[PDB]
TrEMBL record, chains A, B:
It comes from Human immunodeficiency virus type 1. The keyword Protease applies. Residues 20-89 form the Peptidase A2 domain. The gene is pol. GO terms for biological process: proteolysis. This is Protease. It is a lipid-anchor.
Length: 99, 99
């Protein structure tokens, strides 16, 4: 699909068996999802953006369906105000910025 | 152009006659630039990011060249870790997300 930017580019994702709404974010290096339970060992990481840093749990090799497209990669879990799909997964689904 | 996301989508912008580097960010509603002197009066605005809120100065009708495309709109100036080109300006250059 070709997404216009008049509004937030929100899509439905499936992760860990749950359905969630997330933002397709070209400005995000990594994907960050609100607090939830995921299987596996994880390692702590600090992620910084506007306003500062938050502590997150880094889970590797997580499968996520984005708008119906299966993808695999690292997912950071923590206190984010919105679910964000970053470049690490956008590349996997072949997303591009066009103008 | 068609920009892939294996690397941060950074482009050159020309504002106030100066050349700077900026990130094409579909996850940002608004355009935010690092501290610099812009013309006219400003209005206050609070911007919420991943790590909290910062206070910024809002300047309207600012002329900005993005990767060679002229745009005229609102620009926020504040303590951002990187210059961000948000949806308000992305729409003016006709950017879309495609996959
Ligand atoms: C600041 C950028 C370099 C990176 N940010 C992604 C960015 O797209 C966020 C993503 C974002 C989106 C909504 C809420 C929090 C974070 N948007 C944002 O900061 O925008 C602010 C200015 O415009 C306003 O409208 C959106 C919030 C304001 S980030 O959220 O801090 C971030 C940092 C590291 C990773 N791995 C993933 C994301």
């Amino acid at each position: 699909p070709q997404i216009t930017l008049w509004k937030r580019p929100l899509v439905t994702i499936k992760i860990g068996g749950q359905l969630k709404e997330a933002l397709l974010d070209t400005g995000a290096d990594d994907t960050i999802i609100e607090e939830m339970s995921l299987p596996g060992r994880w390692k702590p990481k600090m992620v910084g953006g506007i306003g500062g840093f938050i502590k997150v749990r880094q889970y590797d090799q997580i499968i996520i369906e984005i708008a119906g497209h299966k993808a695999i990669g690292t997912v950071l879990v923590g206190p984010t105000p919105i679910n964000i799909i970053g470049r690490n997964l956008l590349t996997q689904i072949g997303a591009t910025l066009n103008f």
